[PDB]
């Protein structure tokens, strides 16, 4: 009955998946798309995401992971506001490998600080 | 020429753009003073308002419509060190670590604008830095992006994101 939490940041260049324990002091596992893929052009692939999330859900279940919650940042843009695929499909991947999953929390980091908007 | 100096607070933007004013000769303006004394801020009333040889700084100057954005980087770690110099609280540390692991603001130049160049800080002089910057305006190169990737130096940055549960 032991939870974790997957960390998902979408990048422009890469997608990282670091699952750490329920307190988020340990680390269960980190991969990241640079990881398990030859080619730099393929590390933002989603196909890239969901393979390095396969690879982390793995690494969980053996260490007795049963479900994580899940805190996404996945950045887009100002004009289009636009995340892509990635952090989903590595979400998605994560339950296909066999995790259960909980919370799902959008964190997006917002830089900030200088003017401030409305 | 309108260049907007922008990134992650924290970044350098400030100092990098004092310098790149001097060096090239244009004038340095900043964003903020800019806003107030032009009378929370409104982006369109702001990108109204600057609408000379200009280096502007800030992190909503790449939201301006300006001639070419410069994308200040910096590893992250660097980023959490010198927020955590001014004082900011825990959380809005580790918000904009965050921020500059993610390519927030890269993600939204390269969407704003065509002129973007990407310039890595990472161990580089101020100076050193301008001169970069000064070399590719003169080459004259309008774009480059997609030269760092800071999931590389995911483990060094841990100690400043927030992770806990
Ligand atoms: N290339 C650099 N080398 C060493 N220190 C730097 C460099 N660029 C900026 N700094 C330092 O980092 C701190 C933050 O710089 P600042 O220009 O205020 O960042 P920002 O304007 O992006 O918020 C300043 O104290 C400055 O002295
Ligand atoms: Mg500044």
């Known amino acids: 009955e032991k939870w974790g939490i997957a960390h998902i940041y979408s990048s422009y260049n890469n997608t990282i998946i670091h699952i750490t324990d329920i307190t988020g002091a340990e680390t269960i596992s980190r991969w990241s798309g640079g990881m398990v893929v030859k080619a730099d052009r393929d590390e933002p692939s989603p196909y890239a995401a969901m393979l390095a999330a396969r690879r982390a859900a793995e690494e969980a279940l053996e260490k007795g992971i049963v479900g994580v919650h899940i805190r996404v940042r996945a950045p887009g843009g100002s004009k289009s506001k636009t995340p892509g695929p990635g952090a989903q499909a590595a979400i998605r991947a994560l339950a296909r490998a066999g995790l259960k999953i909980g919370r799902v929390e959008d964190v997006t980091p917002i830089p900030h600080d200088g003017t401030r908007p409305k | ?165």
């Open chain 2, 1 to 165: 020429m309108l260049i907007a100096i922008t990134g992650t607070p924290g970044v350098g933007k400030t100092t990098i753009a004092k310098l790149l004013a001097e060096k090239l000769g244009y004038e340095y303006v900043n964003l903020r003073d800019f806003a107030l004394e032009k009378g929370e801020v409104e982006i369109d009333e702001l990108a109204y308002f600057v609408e000379r040889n200009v280096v502007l700084d800030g992190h909503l100057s790449h939201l301006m419509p300006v001639d070419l954005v410069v994308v200040l980087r910096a590893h992250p770690r660097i980023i959490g060190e010198r927020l955590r110099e001014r004082g900011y609280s825990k959380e809005k540390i580790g918000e904009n670590v965050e921020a500059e692991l993610v390519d927030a603001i890269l993600i939204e130049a390269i969407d704003e604008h065509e002129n973007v160049i990407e310039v890595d800080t990472t161990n580089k002089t101020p100076e050193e830095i301008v001169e970069e910057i000064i070399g590719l305006i003169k080459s004259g190169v309008k774009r480059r992006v997609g030269i760092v990737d800071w999931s590389e130096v995911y483990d060094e940055i841990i100690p400043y994101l927030r992770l806990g549960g």
